[PDB]
């Protein structure tokens, strides 16, 4: 079997992607947010207390005729921007993009921090990093990539997120028209649970690459960038009045600036994140400081290839018995 679904961005500066997901029997479509940096797949709900919903649709379990309380199952997550989400857990079929599993635990919330609650376009999360991060307790359950790739044509998913644009979450198979070029496969560390690979350096604009070793992670989940303090700076000096600002949160810049692209290394291939995908715009309303893409890792505890670098390939998360990261350019 194979699955494909659009991806669309929430709003015009890329700050995250929903993906519509189909619950329970009749289906409920609830648009969820892929993140291959965590392991739950859970939902805004009839059962998330009332004045922590805002807009977001809901699922609700007492209305889908395949749904089963998991009994005894519970869930807690926080995720490294400070918000979280707790609750109890269901079993319901889940289909995307036409691929179906049935038995998938859904998980409920009950509770919700202010950061979800207040993003009305983001009906909830759909894990894809590897289970051994599921929060659910006492029995950790699968995600829905784990539960499907037995059933796959081929044991991957791919993503192609777009830049102001829609793209593509694919299952199943690689789709060859989607790429320029030839795809890279690097090594993938599954020992912290995600799917964690190590670039081989970066370059600033037309300036020349320097060969270093980049842990970090592929994030969906994550917007941004962020990489250790030497690329970052090394990025910045090239901007114009860029600066680091501690009140603002990371590295801002006038609005007014032309950013150079930013390059990084895939094996001794190379993938160019142009400058426009390094611009998140306005720090509020009207000001003309502009906030950066490309952010510190430092105080993080890992670096991370967020939408900003993610966007900029066609990528391929291999789950063959050994796992492997694809990166082509397209
Ligand atoms: C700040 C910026 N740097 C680029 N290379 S294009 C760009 C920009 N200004 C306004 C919108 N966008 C995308």
Redesign the pocket.
Known sequence: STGSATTTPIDSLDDAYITPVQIGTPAQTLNLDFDTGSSDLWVFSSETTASEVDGQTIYTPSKSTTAKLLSGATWSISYGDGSSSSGDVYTDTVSVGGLTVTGQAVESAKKVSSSFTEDSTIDGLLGLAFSTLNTVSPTQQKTFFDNAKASLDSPVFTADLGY?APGTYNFGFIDTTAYTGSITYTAVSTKQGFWEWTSTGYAVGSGTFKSTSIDGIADTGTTLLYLPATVVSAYWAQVSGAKSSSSVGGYV?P???????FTFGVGSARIVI??????F?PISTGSSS?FGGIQSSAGIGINIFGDVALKAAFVVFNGATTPTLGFASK
């Open positions: 102001h810049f609005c007014s600036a032309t950013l150079p692209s142009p400058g426009d995908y390094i611009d715009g502009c």
